Amino acid sequence: VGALIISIASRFFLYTGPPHVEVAAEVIFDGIPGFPITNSFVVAIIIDIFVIALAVAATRNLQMVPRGLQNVMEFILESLYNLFRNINAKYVATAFPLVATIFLFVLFGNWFGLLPGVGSIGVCHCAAQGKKLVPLFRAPAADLNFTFAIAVISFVFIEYWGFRALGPGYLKKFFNTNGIMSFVGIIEFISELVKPFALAFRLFGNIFAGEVLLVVMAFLVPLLLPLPFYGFEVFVGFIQALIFALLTYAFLNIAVT
Amino acid sequence: IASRFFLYTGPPHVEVAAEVIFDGIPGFPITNSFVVAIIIDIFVIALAVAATRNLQMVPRGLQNVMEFILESLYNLFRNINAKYVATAFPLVATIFLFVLFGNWFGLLPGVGSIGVCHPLSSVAAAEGEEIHDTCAAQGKKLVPLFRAPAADLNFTFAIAVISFVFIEYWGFRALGPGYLKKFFNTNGIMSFVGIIEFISELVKPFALAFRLFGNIFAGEVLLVVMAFLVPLLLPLPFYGFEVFVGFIQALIFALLTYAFLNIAVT
Amino acid sequence: MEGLNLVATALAVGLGAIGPGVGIGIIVSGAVQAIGRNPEIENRVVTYMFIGIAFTEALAIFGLVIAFLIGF
Amino acid sequence: MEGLNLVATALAVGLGAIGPGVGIGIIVSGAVQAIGRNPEIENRVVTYMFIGIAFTEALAIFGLVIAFLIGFG
Amino acid sequence: MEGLNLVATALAVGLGAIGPGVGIGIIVSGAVQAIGRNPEIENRVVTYMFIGIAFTEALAIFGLVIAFLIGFG
Amino acid sequence: MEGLNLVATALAVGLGAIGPGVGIGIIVSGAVQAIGRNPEIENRVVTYMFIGIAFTEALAIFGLVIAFLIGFG
Amino acid sequence: MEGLNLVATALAVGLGAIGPGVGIGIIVSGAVQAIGRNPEIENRVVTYMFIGIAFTEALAIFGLVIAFLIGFG
Amino acid sequence: MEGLNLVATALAVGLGAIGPGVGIGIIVSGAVQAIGRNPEIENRVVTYMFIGIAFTEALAIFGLVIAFLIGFG
Amino acid sequence: MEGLNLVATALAVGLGAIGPGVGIGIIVSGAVQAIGRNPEIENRVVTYMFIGIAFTEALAIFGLVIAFLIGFG
Amino acid sequence: MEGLNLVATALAVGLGAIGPGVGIGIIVSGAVQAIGRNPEIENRVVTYMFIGIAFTEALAIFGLVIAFLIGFG
Amino acid sequence: MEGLNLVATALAVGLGAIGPGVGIGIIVSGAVQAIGRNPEIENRVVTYMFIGIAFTEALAIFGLVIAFLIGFG
Amino acid sequence: MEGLNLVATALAVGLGAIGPGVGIGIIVSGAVQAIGRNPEIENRVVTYMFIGIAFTEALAIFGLVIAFLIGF
Amino acid sequence: GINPTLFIAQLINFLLLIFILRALLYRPVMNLLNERTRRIEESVRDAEKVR
């Protein structure tokens, strides 16, 4: 294609308005007398349905020679299994399902955030009407509760497995050395304490920054300008999923050792 | 060891001032640094005369130490340039010895204590004491009769100017009209480099004098502040660092003078 | 003193860009240099490279998250 | 002050382009030094370089986004 | 006059992230180069590098928690 | 207090140029070192060099354009 | 001024994370490189690394103490 | 105030000295080291050196011309 | 207007921890590199390492003394 | 207020010292190392070194000139 | 406003610790590495390291002395 | 407001300490390394070494000079 | 979001998903991989047995 692109001035004809998407919390999807249904819980359930559907479609046959969707499903699992075998020797089977789920779920959550209608389709609670518009299908990782939940389950998993593998040694570390692990030990303890905060905040901030980047680049020029940033975002969603999986597995490996 | 750092006897504050003019009853008034420099020069002359009066084979005593220092200085100077290892030795060696003596004089007792004047008193629950001085009466400031000779800008400026003049004279001795060919030669981009080199050569003596005076003044001020912080046992590492730094700067001044002479020659 | 929160946000995001950006650059350069010298050890290297990049981005995202908390 | 907005936008951009620039330069220098020896790895390291470059751009673009969030409310 | 606590929190977090980021960057670069040079000494290396990333991160976290005491309380 | 916008433009160009400039310097140094090491891959190195330069220039371009948006309306 | 007290603690802890963080980072990078080059010198390497880490963390300790004194009064 | 223009142009010129100055330093050091290693390709990298120099100078010029727009108003 | 000195106290510590400790780290790196290759030279080089560490610590002590002077008047 | 021009000149000279100073330091270190590695090509690299200096100092000179303009009119 | 002298003293002392501290660290690390790789040349290398340290410490003491003149003048 | 001249002088002298300090550090490290590699050329390089420091010193002196122009 | 009830609800949702996914395809895929590597090892052993 030629570089003499003249459609870059489409903001005059198509103005998306100011970046109204600035909410740092959840918005209720449907009014239910029980617990509220957030904009992220509904897309979490949608991702659950999609993951279950692909899992049952790729394992309905259990063909010896994987082909089509079965090979696609098996390749990423083989890659993750080889990765965790490289990281640790005998703890791959103990932690593989949890890390694989916590990778795939956040992968599909970040990939859903780039889908059209995330920042546009919504429900009145619309500027012409008297009800303020709230967006629909807010990415689950943008919600803080989901990130805190995965961080705290990772912390529980690593602490429980370290304690089980090391007996009473992992419970109190080696604070009785008094020569070296007397000031390094408390630093390691506070690092472990703030590790779930870092793990949750990384994903939350990355996804929030990505979505506000999409909104701002739509605000500036909504034609052919945010394409490289959209490519970067669909790349960085998978990148952040792999980061979360690799970091939680490596933290488990360094805690058990 | 960790319970003898009493602060009941400490300075009320830190006296940081410029050069203090002495009384000067007769004509040509002198300063407090001038008397210290004269005393240091007298001591250096006495030591040199003691070394020279007993000169023979197998030196021992102060003469042996003087010979070792002279040999080390000669080796250091010949490591840079052997053309003027003996010709430029005099001024550099004298400046180094005078700087070392002035730096060592700053650690002697009585520096900032004797005032020429032309526990209960300490404040409780305070990091610093508030003990009044002897010369606090009559609105005086307890002018220090004893002070570091290098802590005055006049002596440092004079030494730097003399070193620069000596370097310029040695360069102009046998180099032809090379200063004009090296500075602003009007040969491509070399003119800017020559102008910058000339500016650096002009500012070098001011830089050296400022460095020496600032180092001496900052060492004295740091020692005073450390004494005001804790009465004793706290400033031992700082005093050792200052003692090492005095000799380091005394040697560095001579090394820089020799290097400047070599660079002007080459 | 209006607009002070904007200055706070700018300062936080700028410092979080300056620090972790240089950290990311150093990490990636060192890892690619090690791979170029020793391509056989690349599989063992890439995991730790991602770990370091994750830590740097964690600091930067700390800055950005505190900026978001300041803005709202 | 009334003028703190635009300065903040500037402080969002100028402070946001210091570290990413140095990181980009260091990344490209490392990739070039790693392509001088064993250019048959020319794909892989460059791919990692791309990973790295994205991360640097990410930080930079964050500031730019914040700048717009300061530039127009 | 009134928004100084927000500026304090922002400065605390930014200055606590600007330094340890470069620290962990050089830690990871050195550890990677040592791993590539001598894979047989990896184990101690890993522990030591984690000890390193135990230190600097904590310092950053210290700044963060200081900001956590500044924004609230 | 009306001159704060000029300070904003100055900061946006200055701090936006101090980053990409050092990166460009490191890129050129690495490229020249690689040419010294392996001239036959030289052209390929040169290609990647421009890419790296472009990215830094991109930031510099940003550091210019928003500055005008600070200078102008 | 009503503020200018939280900013003091913020700046103190931030710069005390700037300095010792990069210092410990360079310490760990050098130590791990020396470990990779020389395995059996690990005892003296570890001892000198710990000495340097303590000497570098003394500044961070001073900064934290000063910040605590400012915050408490 | 009535002096913010002077501060703006001074900061702009200073940062334009900061960035391209370090860029030029790194470029010259790398080019000189590579030329000393291998003078045969010297002229070639010199061109690239100058190219890099020009780019760095361009950034400085940009800052300078912005300061020019601050110098006269 | 009144608490600025407290902020100054932070600076008198804060930046005072930036230069020395990083330099200290650099020193340690060199020192440990000197033991990665030459074990028996440790008695010659640890003294110079301690001298450099003491000089950087003296700069830090200058900062701490200034902090004490501006924290009590 | 009153000292805005003085602060402007001081900041400009300080930035033109921090940038070009490190630039010429890198230039001289690289040139000296290259000369030590190859004394036969010394003249050429020396000229290149001077050229680099003749650029870098020039930038600093520009800053000083700008400061003097702010000092005078 | 009121206590600008103490702020100036703290800033000058902090920057004089920032710069020459890194300079001394680089000098000592380079000298120790060269002595470790060349144990028969330190007889002048140590002296050259000391004079470079003297230059950097002279700059630091320049900062300290100017800060003292601000605080007591 | 108080006197901004003190702040100006402090900033100028401090930055003149920052820049030329690191420049001198890099220069001395490079010269020491080169002397340790090839001592037979040391005089030449040490001459050049001093030249570099001179320029850096001038820059620092320049700051001090303008600092005095703000002092009085 | 700050409320602990919604937090615990999302946590329980995640636990239910990891438990149903680990028993749906993770175990069959792990068993398939184990069977494949057992097939490879018995193929090698049976070639040795052929010799």
PDB file of N, CA and C in Angstrom, chain B residues 14 16 79 207 210-211 214-215 218 221, chain K residues 44 51 54 58 61-62 64-65 68 72:
ATOM      1  N   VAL B  14      29.220  25.862  65.697  1.00  0.00           N
ATOM      2  CA  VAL B  14      30.356  25.651  64.808  1.00  0.00           C
ATOM      3  C   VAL B  14      30.739  26.999  64.216  1.00  0.00           C
ATOM      4  N   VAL B  16      32.337  28.932  61.577  1.00  0.00           N
ATOM      5  CA  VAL B  16      32.788  28.845  60.192  1.00  0.00           C
ATOM      6  C   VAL B  16      32.876  30.275  59.672  1.00  0.00           C
ATOM      7  N   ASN B  79      59.300   9.138  37.028  1.00  0.00           N
ATOM      8  CA  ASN B  79      58.291   8.309  36.379  1.00  0.00           C
ATOM      9  C   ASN B  79      57.452   9.095  35.381  1.00  0.00           C
ATOM     10  N   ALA B 207      42.073  26.951  39.740  1.00  0.00           N
ATOM     11  CA  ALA B 207      41.485  25.686  40.164  1.00  0.00           C
ATOM     12  C   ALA B 207      42.303  25.037  41.273  1.00  0.00           C
ATOM     13  N   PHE B 210      41.947  27.136  44.549  1.00  0.00           N
ATOM     14  CA  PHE B 210      40.621  26.927  45.114  1.00  0.00           C
ATOM     15  C   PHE B 210      40.496  25.536  45.719  1.00  0.00           C
ATOM     16  N   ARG B 211      41.039  24.517  45.045  1.00  0.00           N
ATOM     17  CA  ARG B 211      40.974  23.158  45.573  1.00  0.00           C
ATOM     18  C   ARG B 211      41.719  23.040  46.894  1.00  0.00           C
ATOM     19  N   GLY B 214      39.833  25.171  49.649  1.00  0.00           N
ATOM     20  CA  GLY B 214      38.584  24.527  50.003  1.00  0.00           C
ATOM     21  C   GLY B 214      38.795  23.241  50.774  1.00  0.00           C
ATOM     22  N   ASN B 215      39.795  22.449  50.376  1.00  0.00           N
ATOM     23  CA  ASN B 215      40.077  21.204  51.083  1.00  0.00           C
ATOM     24  C   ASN B 215      40.484  21.474  52.523  1.00  0.00           C
ATOM     25  N   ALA B 218      37.362  22.880  54.461  1.00  0.00           N
ATOM     26  CA  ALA B 218      36.370  21.837  54.684  1.00  0.00           C
ATOM     27  C   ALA B 218      36.852  20.809  55.692  1.00  0.00           C
ATOM     28  N   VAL B 221      36.411  22.514  59.054  1.00  0.00           N
ATOM     29  CA  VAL B 221      34.998  22.632  59.403  1.00  0.00           C
ATOM     30  C   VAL B 221      34.417  21.272  59.770  1.00  0.00           C
TER      31      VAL B 221
ATOM     32  N   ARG K  44      52.928   3.058  39.932  1.00  0.00           N
ATOM     33  CA  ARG K  44      52.454   4.354  39.462  1.00  0.00           C
ATOM     34  C   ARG K  44      50.944   4.395  39.283  1.00  0.00           C
ATOM     35  N   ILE K  51      45.570  10.656  42.365  1.00  0.00           N
ATOM     36  CA  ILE K  51      45.411  12.018  41.849  1.00  0.00           C
ATOM     37  C   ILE K  51      44.048  12.200  41.176  1.00  0.00           C
ATOM     38  N   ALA K  54      41.799  12.709  43.906  1.00  0.00           N
ATOM     39  CA  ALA K  54      41.995  14.070  44.390  1.00  0.00           C
ATOM     40  C   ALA K  54      41.195  15.068  43.565  1.00  0.00           C
ATOM     41  N   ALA K  58      38.172  17.079  45.060  1.00  0.00           N
ATOM     42  CA  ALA K  58      38.236  18.533  44.982  1.00  0.00           C
ATOM     43  C   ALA K  58      36.917  19.107  44.490  1.00  0.00           C
ATOM     44  N   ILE K  61      34.501  18.775  47.423  1.00  0.00           N
ATOM     45  CA  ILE K  61      34.794  19.784  48.432  1.00  0.00           C
ATOM     46  C   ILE K  61      34.427  21.176  47.933  1.00  0.00           C
ATOM     47  N   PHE K  62      34.495  21.413  46.621  1.00  0.00           N
ATOM     48  CA  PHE K  62      33.951  22.650  46.068  1.00  0.00           C
ATOM     49  C   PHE K  62      32.472  22.779  46.399  1.00  0.00           C
ATOM     50  N   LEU K  64      30.863  21.234  48.837  1.00  0.00           N
ATOM     51  CA  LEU K  64      30.720  21.343  50.287  1.00  0.00           C
ATOM     52  C   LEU K  64      31.053  22.749  50.779  1.00  0.00           C
ATOM     53  N   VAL K  65      32.100  23.356  50.220  1.00  0.00           N
ATOM     54  CA  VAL K  65      32.529  24.685  50.643  1.00  0.00           C
ATOM     55  C   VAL K  65      31.516  25.737  50.217  1.00  0.00           C
ATOM     56  N   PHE K  68      28.731  25.458  52.616  1.00  0.00           N
ATOM     57  CA  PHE K  68      29.093  26.086  53.885  1.00  0.00           C
ATOM     58  C   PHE K  68      29.009  27.606  53.801  1.00  0.00           C
ATOM     59  N   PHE K  72      26.682  29.801  56.167  1.00  0.00           N
ATOM     60  CA  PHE K  72      27.334  30.706  57.110  1.00  0.00           C
ATOM     61  C   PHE K  72      27.817  31.961  56.398  1.00  0.00           C
TER      62      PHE K  72
END
